[PDB]
Amino acid sequence: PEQLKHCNGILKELLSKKHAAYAWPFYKPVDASALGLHDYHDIIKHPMDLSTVKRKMENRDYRDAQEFAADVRLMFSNCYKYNPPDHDVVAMARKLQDVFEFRYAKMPD
Numbered sequence: 001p002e003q004l005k006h007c008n009g010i011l012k013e014l015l016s017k018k019h020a021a022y023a024w025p026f027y028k029p030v031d032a033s034a035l036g037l038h039d040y041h042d043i044i045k046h047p048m049d050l051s052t053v054k055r056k057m058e059n060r061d062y063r064d065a066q067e068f069a070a071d072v073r074l075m076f077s078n079c080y081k082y083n084p085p086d087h088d089v090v091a092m093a094r095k096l097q098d099v100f101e102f103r104y105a106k107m108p109d
Ligand SMILES: COC(=O)C[C@@H]1N=C(c2ccc3cc[nH]c3c2)c2cc(OC)ccc2-n2c(C)nnc21
Pocket: 024, 025, 026, 030, 031, 035, 037, 078, 079, 082, 083, 088, 089
């Protein structure tokens, strides 16, 4: 229970204006059609984004911190999986993930 409150604070920081310069591609689900990505859902079997994490947190769908962490890492992993390593969105994902991983590691154990 206390770990999920810490994860909620993590989610608020990831969504905060402080990180908007690199977090914004992850605010909403990838719209493959709008982005012209005809193969996105062939490659990415389980899409994830911060608005989906926020909904599941608000509706108390996560049973523990590890389930929350798996969704956030899935969001980043999808980005790395679909895109080349020098892509700008990959650089943004790495910057947001450093925020997530550091706050997550400070979780009371
Ligand atoms: C054509 O889209 C692609 O190639 C893959 C795609 N990319 C970018 C993106 C973001 C910032 C920059 C800066 C220069 N290029 C960029 C591309 C992108 C842009 C979005 O807008 C609302 C939403 C999702 C992504 N998104 C995620 C998440 N995971 N993959 C992608």
